[PDB]
Amino acid sequence: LGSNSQVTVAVRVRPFSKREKTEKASQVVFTNGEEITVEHPDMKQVYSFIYDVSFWSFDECHPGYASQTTVYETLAAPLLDRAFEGYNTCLFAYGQTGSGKSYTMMGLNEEPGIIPRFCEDLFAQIAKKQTSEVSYHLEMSFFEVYNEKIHDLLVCKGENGQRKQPLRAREHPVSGPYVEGLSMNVVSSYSDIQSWLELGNKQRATAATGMNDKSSRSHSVFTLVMTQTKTEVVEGEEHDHRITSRINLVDLAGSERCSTAHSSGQRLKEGVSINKSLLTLGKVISALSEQANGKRVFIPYRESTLTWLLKESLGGNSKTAMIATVSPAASNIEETLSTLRYATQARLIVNIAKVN
Amino acid sequence: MRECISIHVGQAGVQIGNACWELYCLEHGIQPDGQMPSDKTIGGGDDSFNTFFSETGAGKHVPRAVFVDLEPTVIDEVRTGTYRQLFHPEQLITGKEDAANNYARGHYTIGKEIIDLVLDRIRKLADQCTGLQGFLVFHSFGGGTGSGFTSLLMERLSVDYGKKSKLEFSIYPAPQVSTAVVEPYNSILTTHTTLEHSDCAFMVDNEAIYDICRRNLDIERPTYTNLNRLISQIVSSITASLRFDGALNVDLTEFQTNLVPYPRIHFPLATYAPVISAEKAYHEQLSVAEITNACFEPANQMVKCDPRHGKYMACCLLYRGDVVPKDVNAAIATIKTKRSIQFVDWCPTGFKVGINYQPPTVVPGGDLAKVQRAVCMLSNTTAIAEAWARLDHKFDLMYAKRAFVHWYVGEGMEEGEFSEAREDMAALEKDYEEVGVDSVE
Amino acid sequence: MREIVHIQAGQCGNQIGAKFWEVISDEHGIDPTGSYHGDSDLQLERINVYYNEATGNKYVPRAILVDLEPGTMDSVRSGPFGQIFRPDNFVFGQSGAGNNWAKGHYTEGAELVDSVLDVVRKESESCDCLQGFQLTHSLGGGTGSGMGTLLISKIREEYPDRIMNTFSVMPSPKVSDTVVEPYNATLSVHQLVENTDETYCIDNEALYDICFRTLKLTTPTYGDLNHLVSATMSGVTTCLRFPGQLNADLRKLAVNMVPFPRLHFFMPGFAPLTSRGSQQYRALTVPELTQQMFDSKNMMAACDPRHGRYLTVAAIFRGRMSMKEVDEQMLNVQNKNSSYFVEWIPNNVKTAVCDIPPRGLKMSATFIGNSTAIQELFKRISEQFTAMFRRKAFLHWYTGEGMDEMEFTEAESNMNDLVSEYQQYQDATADEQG
Numbered sequence A: 001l002g003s004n005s006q007v008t009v010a011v012r013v014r015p016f017s018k019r020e021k022t023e024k025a026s027q028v029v030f031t032n033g034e035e036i037t038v039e040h041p042d043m044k045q046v047y048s049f050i051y052d053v054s055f056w057s058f059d060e061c062h063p064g065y066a067s068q069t070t071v072y073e074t075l076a077a078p079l080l081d082r083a084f085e086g087y088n089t090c091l092f093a094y095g096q097t098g099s100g101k102s103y104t105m106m107g108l109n110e111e112p113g114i115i116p117r118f119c120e121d122l123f124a125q126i127a128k129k130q131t132s133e134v135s136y137h138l139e140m141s142f143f144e145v146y147n148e149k150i151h152d153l154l155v156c157k158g159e160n161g162q163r164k165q166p167l168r169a170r171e172h173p174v175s176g177p178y179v180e181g182l183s184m185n186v187v188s189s190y191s192d193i194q195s196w197l198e199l200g201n202k203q204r205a206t207a208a209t210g211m212n213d214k215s216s217r218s219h220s221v222f223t224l225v226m227t228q229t230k231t232e233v234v235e236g237e238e239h240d241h242r243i244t245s246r247i248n249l250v251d252l253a254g255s256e257r258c259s260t261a262h263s264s265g266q267r268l269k270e271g272v273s274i275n276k277s278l279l280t281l282g283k284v285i286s287a288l289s290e291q292a293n294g295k296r297v298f299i300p301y302r303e304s305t306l307t308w309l310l311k312e313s314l315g316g317n318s319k320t321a322m323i324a325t326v327s328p329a330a331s332n333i334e335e336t337l338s339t340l341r342y343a344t345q346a347r348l349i350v351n352i353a354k355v356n
Numbered sequence B: 001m002r003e004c005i006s007i008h009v010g011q012a013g014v015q016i017g018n019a020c021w022e023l024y025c026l027e028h029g030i031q032p033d034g035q036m037p038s039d040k041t042i043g044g045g046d047d048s049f050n051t052f053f054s055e056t057g058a059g060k061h062v063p064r065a066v067f068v069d070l071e072p073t074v075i076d077e078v079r080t081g082t083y084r085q086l087f088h089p090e091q092l093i094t095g096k097e098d099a100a101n102n103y104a105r106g107h108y109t110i111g112k113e114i115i116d117l118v119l120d121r122i123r124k125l126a127d128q129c130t131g132l133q134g135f136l137v138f139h140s141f142g143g144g145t146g147s148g149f150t151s152l153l154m155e156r157l158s159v160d161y162g163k164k165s166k167l168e169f170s171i172y173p174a175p176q177v178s179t180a181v182v183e184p185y186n187s188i189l190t191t192h193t194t195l196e197h198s199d200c201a202f203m204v205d206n207e208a209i210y211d212i213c214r215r216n217l218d219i220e221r222p223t224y225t226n227l228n229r230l231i232s233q234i235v236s237s238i239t240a241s242l243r244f245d246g247a248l249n250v251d252l253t254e255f256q257t258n259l260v261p262y263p264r265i266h267f268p269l270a271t272y273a274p275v276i277s278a279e280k281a282y283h284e285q286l287s288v289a290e291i292t293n294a295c296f297e298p299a300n301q302m303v304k305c306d307p308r309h310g311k312y313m314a315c316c317l318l319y320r321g322d323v324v325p326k327d328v329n330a331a332i333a334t335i336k337t338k339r340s341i342q343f344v345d346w347c348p349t350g351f352k353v354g355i356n357y358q359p360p361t362v363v364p365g366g367d368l369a370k371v372q373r374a375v376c377m378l379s380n381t382t383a384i385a386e387a388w389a390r391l392d393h394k395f396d397l398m399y400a401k402r403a404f405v406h407w408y409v410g411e412g413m414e415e416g417e418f419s420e421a422r423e424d425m426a427a428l429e430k431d432y433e434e435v436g437v438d439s440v441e
Numbered sequence C: 001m002r003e004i005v006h007i008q009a010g011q012c013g014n015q016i017g018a019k020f021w022e023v024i025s026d027e028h029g030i031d032p033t034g035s036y037h038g039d040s041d042l043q044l045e046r047i048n049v050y051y052n053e054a055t056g057n058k059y060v061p062r063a064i065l066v067d068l069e070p071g072t073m074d075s076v077r078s079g080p081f082g083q084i085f086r087p088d089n090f091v092f093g094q095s096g097a098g099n100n101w102a103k104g105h106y107t108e109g110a111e112l113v114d115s116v117l118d119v120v121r122k123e124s125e126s127c128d129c130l131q132g133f134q135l136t137h138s139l140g141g142g143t144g145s146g147m148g149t150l151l152i153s154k155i156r157e158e159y160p161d162r163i164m165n166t167f168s169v170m171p172s173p174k175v176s177d178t179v180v181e182p183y184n185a186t187l188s189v190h191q192l193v194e195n196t197d198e199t200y201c202i203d204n205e206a207l208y209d210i211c212f213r214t215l216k217l218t219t220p221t222y223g224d225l226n227h228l229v230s231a232t233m234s235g236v237t238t239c240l241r242f243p244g245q246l247n248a249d250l251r252k253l254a255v256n257m258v259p260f261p262r263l264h265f266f267m268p269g270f271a272p273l274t275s276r277g278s279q280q281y282r283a284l285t286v287p288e289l290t291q292q293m294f295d296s297k298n299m300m301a302a303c304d305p306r307h308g309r310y311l312t313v314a315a316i317f318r319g320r321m322s323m324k325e326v327d328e329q330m331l332n333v334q335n336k337n338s339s340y341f342v343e344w345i346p347n348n349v350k351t352a353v354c355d356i357p358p359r360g361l362k363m364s365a366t367f368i369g370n371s372t373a374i375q376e377l378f379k380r381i382s383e384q385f386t387a388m389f390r391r392k393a394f395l396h397w398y399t400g401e402g403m404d405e406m407e408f409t410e411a412e413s414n415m416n417d418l419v420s421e422y423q424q425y426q427d428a429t430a431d432e433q434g
Ligand SMILES: CC(=O)O[C@H]1C(=O)[C@@]2(C)[C@H]([C@H](OC(=O)c3ccccc3)[C@]3(O)C[C@H](OC(=O)[C@H](O)[C@@H](NC(=O)c4ccccc4)c4ccccc4)C(C)=C1C3(C)C)[C@]1(OC(C)=O)CO[C@@H]1C[C@@H]2O
Pocket: C022, C023, C026, C027, C215, C223, C224, C225, C227, C228, C230, C231, C232, C234, C235, C271, C272, C273, C274, C275, C276, C279, C358, C359, C360, C361
């Protein structure tokens, strides 16, 4: 208690896509450092936004190319030092459909994201100071929000026509919200967590739509728990005091307008739910921004499961970071601007982090 | 011959339509069974006017109309009414449930399943027409059907038909009166989607017509049946020259040309001056000067806005009956002499005139008197921007807190769609301002 | 094309239903043997909304009666309008819930809900296009709370794109009729806040005050309380059965009454009501009906709107009326009483008019209000709740049936969060510039 933090802000720009090269769209997003400027195609006006870090992955030729490992060592490594210091940690993305979110946190086989780097770097960090004075313990789960329902992705299943088992949320009067039945499996080596991860991502819900051939029909939260047992000077029982750190790495879905990417059936329902969830999230950020202005505000958490489980990961007791993602095409002006506005709001959120 | 198709979307549209088709059936001699009795003396002719009614060999006249509500009540009041044997049985209740005053239901969840059928029927109608000259869409900013379905339909028609005049008659949301908590949203989204497809949207308000029926007709307790009968006359004044003979005939394109300077300011207001009881039909001369000045009184406008807080960009005065052009020349001169009626510097010729020889018909059971002269004023003014501003402000007051949004997002919509719309309307307000700045070298 | 399923759980539910069907039949012209003996032809145009044809121009209700005590079902059968119901829709057991939410939700209701769901599926699949459901249930006891909420959850899971409405008799402030009301109410609220779309909160003390002041009745039985509630139930769904100048339905009301999803708890009311003698001294016009509607002493919710601000109100008028006077009167209510409304909603009043009034009235009106004063109910429960829960006063009868304390804390938290969401919108503060 007594801490006073800020919900940090990173902002990536992806390259031109296939559709964006089919239809020759021009450049509207520009980077000049940590300040990012977007102006309309019709030369109406110019908006510029201040942020904590920016990442211009547009072209490999530029100076200051912000590849995967730069994003990592700028966001996760600080968060990892905080997690080893005795804090809980959260890193959550936000953006448009196809804006480059799952490329960042998790990533592709030949260019991993923050998850396969965070887990490996903390394994190494443990390998340098796993004394017999201080011992370490690791477990994890990796769960999914799909159509208002929680799913566990690290679950081997048999062959069925009906096999997808939804879990429940509950509220512990001290610990806060949590999930009932979330298999937290022990992970003592990098091969183990890699096998878990590839068991998970292969279970995450996806489908082909207009803006992505492999789109995300769900939100994904990666729950990696680390306890560390330490000794202080007492002549009785030692290895006596525990310090815990829960890591929550969050990749969300898109906005999914039904005109830019027409859908019918299940592909339409998911979209609705996704959008609904995101809307509530916006309110939270806005409302919490108002809490920085000293105004009496009520934060809606309970309208969705995402904003309910991550209650403590926005206010509460954890150090949290946002990653906005945008596109350089002159089409995605309104979605880009809504993104950057929500990031400007999230910049202003404070959080009272607990030392464990 | 010349032919126009009417599309009566929504409760409001259907009620306006029932009134209008009552009026047209009376004007042309058609009975509710479709059977004209006096064609036995004509032997064909064209007095069974092809602008609105298609004729069979059996002597039955069928209106060129389409009726959509997305709920069964209103059209079932037609199928079981006095005009059940007039309309083709293809009046379209495919509405097992309605739009719940949600543009998202009206444009995506139930915007689809019904529009293919609507368009097929319009196609069947238009194939029966040689000289198709325009569409007339009756609807209401405020609901879902009359907002979203109208938006979608105009989108499809601007593809399938193209350069055909698509005029609209819309109920505008009033400042004080309102029958719903979510009319601002719907109105803004509709004006966003329609403003790139419509050619001229004739806007009315209900507070205005209530005040008219009170002050002039002396009805202290009016209802919609007493209101729409006025609106009908406006259409009968717009659609007169396509039916009857006159001295200065006005085809539909003449509106689209003269009242629409720039392609985004096509929102003119309607006005009908000789709204008099049969009592006050006596005691008054009802000359062209009186009616033409009444049309310019701010208290007799059918949209609650003051032209005195703005300027006139255009005005089309459509006359009916014993009217001589000299009277109109004198009247417009008297108006140009008056200083309270200010025009833009870039419109010295601001008046369009039309004279038909056929006076209006008196609907049996109505509140309006029999007249020898009638006038309809369609005026494009800068005042209505203020009205738009009001709506936009309301939008803000709720969009700040994201109220009533999960009903829209919940029925297939992104939240960004809101912001986009608002921006357009803001630009439109600016555009109105831009056309009020006087020109300087 | 717009069909409604009725479910009745418990004494309160079954007794209100017995009166509600008795009223809808009177409106539509159905006799106690299922036969149509009415005068107007509009009564049959939309009979499908509440009824089904069987064989011989006989009309059977689309109802489902639920209990865990036979005595409430026999009362229906041994009644005036009992022989019209489908006997295969009486789903009852024995050895009821015992004023225990647990027994109705987890133990006994778990052994009986499957039958109810079978009947629900049978009655829904026979629909061309179902609009929603309709549960009359008391909370303050067991079955109506537990079995009710369970059915609600399962229908919402099976039928999520429909409307789920509840007419609920909440506890009263002064006198209790069950000693374990707080727990059960808090848990039923924990279940309803997350699954319903619009619930109508009723309180017997308000209706006693109505029967005493307005109607001047000195010996009011429950058939009179339920007579008022049925009036309301009818009025909510009037613009689906009959025609009007400006129609509405449950979805349009919900869209125009629920700004945020959780605040779907409403105060009902109905006008005109008067003593049998005082009807010759009163003109029945829109002004008098509005004066009676927005009067604090005509609500059934036992919460003074003068202690809050209306978020959004709805008026479903029935009769031949002028829309000018409706809109004028509602505007006047908003302007003269500007402090009891919100600024961030410009017009808080939804309107609807049906042209076909009730059997003996020239005009009538139904009122649905969403106000912050509802907090004064839940807060009370929460106080009561903790006063018991701090001591574990009656818990072992709930834990013995397969519960835990986390459920209680969850329910209390949900209720208090809702109270705060209602509180944030009654402080009429001024912004910096506006
Ligand atoms: C002929 C006449 O003027 O007598 C009226 C009458 O005196 C009053 C008092 C009636 C009377 O109702 C009551 O006195 C009453 C008693 C206990 C609880 C509630 C009401 C009436 O009994 C009730 C009855 O109202 C109806 O019949 C409506 O259709 C009503 N349906 C039923 O009452 C009904 C119930 C069971 C079986 C058959 C019909 C209704 C209300 C809302 C929606 C649909 C239907 C009417 C006109 C009257 C009497 C008969 C005195 C009132 O009825 C209602 C709910 O509006 C009570 O206040 C109104 C005002 C009427 O003036």
